[PDB]
Structure formats: structure tokens, C-alpha cells
Design an enzyme around this catalytic site. Structure first.
Site, PDB file in Angstrom:
ATOM      1  CG  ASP A  28      -2.317   0.591   0.812  1.00 43.71           C
ATOM      2  OD1 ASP A  28      -2.333   1.722   0.266  1.00 43.71           O
ATOM      3  OD2 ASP A  28      -3.354  -0.068   1.034  1.00 43.71           O
ATOM      4  CE1 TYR A 124      -4.675  -4.035  -4.935  1.00 40.83           C
ATOM      5  CE2 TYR A 124      -4.092  -2.472  -6.666  1.00 40.83           C
ATOM      6  CZ  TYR A 124      -4.753  -2.771  -5.469  1.00 40.83           C
ATOM      7  OH  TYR A 124      -5.500  -1.827  -4.813  1.00 40.83           O
ATOM      8  CG  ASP A 163      -5.108  -7.348  -2.400  1.00 36.50           C
ATOM      9  OD1 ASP A 163      -6.202  -7.981  -2.315  1.00 36.50           O
ATOM     10  OD2 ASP A 163      -4.957  -6.141  -2.050  1.00 36.50           O
ATOM     11  CG  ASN A 165      -8.882  -6.265  -3.641  1.00 36.03           C
ATOM     12  OD1 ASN A 165      -9.165  -5.838  -2.497  1.00 36.03           O
ATOM     13  ND2 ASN A 165      -8.024  -5.639  -4.468  1.00 36.03           N
ATOM     14  CG  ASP A 236      -3.237  -9.927   0.937  1.00 31.00           C
ATOM     15  OD1 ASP A 236      -2.868  -9.297  -0.066  1.00 31.00           O
ATOM     16  OD2 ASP A 236      -3.809  -9.361   1.915  1.00 31.00           O
ATOM     17  CG  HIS A 262      -3.161  -5.729   2.418  1.00 26.33           C
ATOM     18  ND1 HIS A 262      -3.979  -6.654   1.815  1.00 26.33           N
ATOM     19  CD2 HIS A 262      -3.643  -4.512   2.073  1.00 26.33           C
ATOM     20  CE1 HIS A 262      -4.930  -6.024   1.140  1.00 26.33           C
ATOM     21  NE2 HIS A 262      -4.744  -4.722   1.271  1.00 26.33           N
TER      22      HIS A 262
END
Length: 271
Positions: A28, A124, A163, A165, A236, A262
Site C-alpha cells: 500500500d 493485484y 491480493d 481482493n 491475500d 495488509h
DNA sequence: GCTGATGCGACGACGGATCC
DNA sequence: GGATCCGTCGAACGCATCAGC
């Protein structure tokens, strides 16, 4: 309830020792993460391969510290139009055989790296957005990603990390009831995850080893002190081809490593 | 060059209704 | 009338651009 990740299991259920350690981390904001001592944690973890998501940083702006990683010297970076968003990275002790970017469709979300005995994909996955404003794009992306993964020309097994999501099941987040209309826990995103497992096919390394363990998360909103309360989400993952499960030693959640919203995750394989 | 404003992207706390 | 369910709303961060000096 708080969570404590079990001790590292460095031997496969058959008794063979782990030979490959892979770490994945949505940092991030890579430059922010580096200032918050994220790289000192990486050096302590000493992985063979390190995958980073949401770097928000083009290559020319990578801080010089990243050039001082002698055990992770083969580095591949990919950033999007929208500078400062998205962006992923893959760093490796050994050179991969091949590296490519994207899912065939410069979004800076996917890196594919072929090693001797396996193909690694780090991703991602696009967020569905506040108010689900980009949920339909996510659904289209999920379907294109599945197709891309299935269609990988190599007969080598697959490791997919990063990730993704989505919290797959109610056990994957603290507040499943009040989040069924929020990004990351819609029935559409959960179904897409199940279809990814079914179609490729893939297993969820962590859930395969710890199928009934609750309160294991990899994300906590910065707000309302959610991390201190372990109000979190498991976003993740390490997903593995079925054939890699006998090599699976452990799949870790490094709950105490700070630097982002994260935490790192870590895969031990016996290859 | 540097700072701070602003824009943009990425849900848990809370207040109220329903249910037995 | 406690438990649950539901919809509404403010808020910790990083990074880009912009204005000002």
C-alpha cells in the site's frame, strides 16, 4: 478475538524439507512502506522470492534501498495512465526463465514468472469499489483472468499469490453479515473466487492446511483501530495447483509485520 | 524545492426495525 | 426486550496535482 499464526512448518506432510520460501505483501505505497521499515522486515524473512502489490510507484522512483538487496537482485516492476495507483513487483534470488506482464488482454496488476519447476503469478486484483461502482468490471476481469490462468501454455504447475481482493467465505472476515454488500465480500466476487479454484484448478494453501481456523486475516482498515481489535479480512492468498499440495509445507500470515494495511504472507514449498 | 489544500481510491460503528 | 438484521455515515492512509512563494 486476536489471532496467533501457528509455528512455521518447514517440512512437508511426507517429511521433506522446504527448499523455497515465497513472501507476498500488499505494501500500500512502496515508498511509504520503505520509510516504515518494511524492508527491514523483508530482510528478516529472507524469502527466495518476494511479490509486492499496490506499490503506487513507477520504476524510476524506486528508492535506492531496493538496489541493496543482494539476495533478491532479479527485480521486475510493473505500473499502470493512473500514476500513483496499483503497480506490482517481483523480486527473486535466482533469475526466472521468463517474465511477462499483464493477462494477455499496461494496467500494472499482474506479473508472470516461469521458474525451473513452476510458474509464479502475482496479482493485484481490481477492487470492486466503494458502493460497488466497479463491481461489473471486476466480474469481467475475474473471467478474463481465469481464462488467462487456465490457458497458460506451460504444463508446469502454478503458484498464484497476491491480493485477490475477496474474502472467499464467512470464515475469511470478521464481520461477514454486515459486509455482504461491500467490495470484497459480494456473492459475485465470492463466486468468482470459487470459479477460479474450480476452473484452473487451484487450492487455497492456507485453508487447505487450516480449514477451520477463524480470525486469520491479512487486511485491516486503517480506521477505527481495526487492526488492534483484529477486525479484518483475508484478502491475500497463495493458490496452488493440485500437484503442488504434496510439496506444501506451510502457508503463513505474518500478523505482526507492520508497514501497510495488509500484512505479509509466506509460502514454504519442498521442491 | 517544499509545504499544505484538495481529489481520489480503498467498512465498522451506530441507530433503528423486526422477531419471538 | 435481547438478539438480530438492515441501511446510513464519517474517517486513516498514500499519492497526484495545484497554488503559492
Amino acid at each position: 478475538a486476536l489471532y496467533e499464526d501457528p509455528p512455521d512448518q518447514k517440512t512437508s506432510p511426507s517429511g521433506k524439507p522446504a527448499t523455497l520460501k515465497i513472501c507476498s505483501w500488499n505494501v500500500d505505497g512502496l515508498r511509504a512502506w520503505i520509510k516504515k521499515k518494511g524492508l527491514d522486515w523483508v530482510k528478516e524473512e529472507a524469502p527466495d522470492i518476494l511479490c509486492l502489490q499496490e506499490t503506487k510507484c513507477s520504476e524510476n522512483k524506486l528508492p535506492a534501498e531496493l538496489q541493496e538487496l543482494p539476495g533478491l537482485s532479479h527485480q521486475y516492476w510493473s505500473a499502470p495512465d493512473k500514476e500513483g495507483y496499483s503497480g506490482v513487483g517481483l523480486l527473486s534470488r535466482q533469475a526466472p526463465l521468463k517474465v511477462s506482464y499483464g493477462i494477455g488482454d499496461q494496467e500494472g496488476r499482474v506479473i508472470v514468472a516461469e521458474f525451473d519447476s513452476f510458474v509464479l503469478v502475482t496479482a493485484y486484483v481490481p477492487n470492486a469499489g466503494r458502493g460497488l461502482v466497479r463491481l461489473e468490471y471486476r466480474q469481467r476481469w475475474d473471467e478474463a483472468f481465469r481464462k488467462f490462468l487456465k490457458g497458460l501454455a506451460s504444463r508446469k504447475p502454478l503458484v498464484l499469490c497476491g491480493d485477490l481482493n475477496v474474502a472467499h467465505e464467512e470464515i475469511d472476515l470478521r464481520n461477514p453479515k454486515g459486509n455482504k454488500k461491500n467490495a470484497g465480500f459480494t456473492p459475485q466476487e465470492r463466486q468468482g473466487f470459487g470459479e477460479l479454484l474450480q476452473a484452473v484448478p487451484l487450492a487455497d494453501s492456507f485453508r487447505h492446511l487450516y480449514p477451520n481456523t477463524p480470525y486469520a486475516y491479512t487486511f485491516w482498515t486503517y480506521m477505527m483501530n481495526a487492526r488492534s481489535k483484529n477486525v479484518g479480512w483475508r484478502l491475500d492468498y497463495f493458490l496452488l495447483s493440485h500437484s503442488l499440495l504434496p510439496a506444501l509445507c506451510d502457508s503463513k500470515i505474518r500478523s505482526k509485520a507492520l508497514g501497510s494495511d495488509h500484512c505479509p504472507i509466506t509460502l514454504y514449498l519442498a521442491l
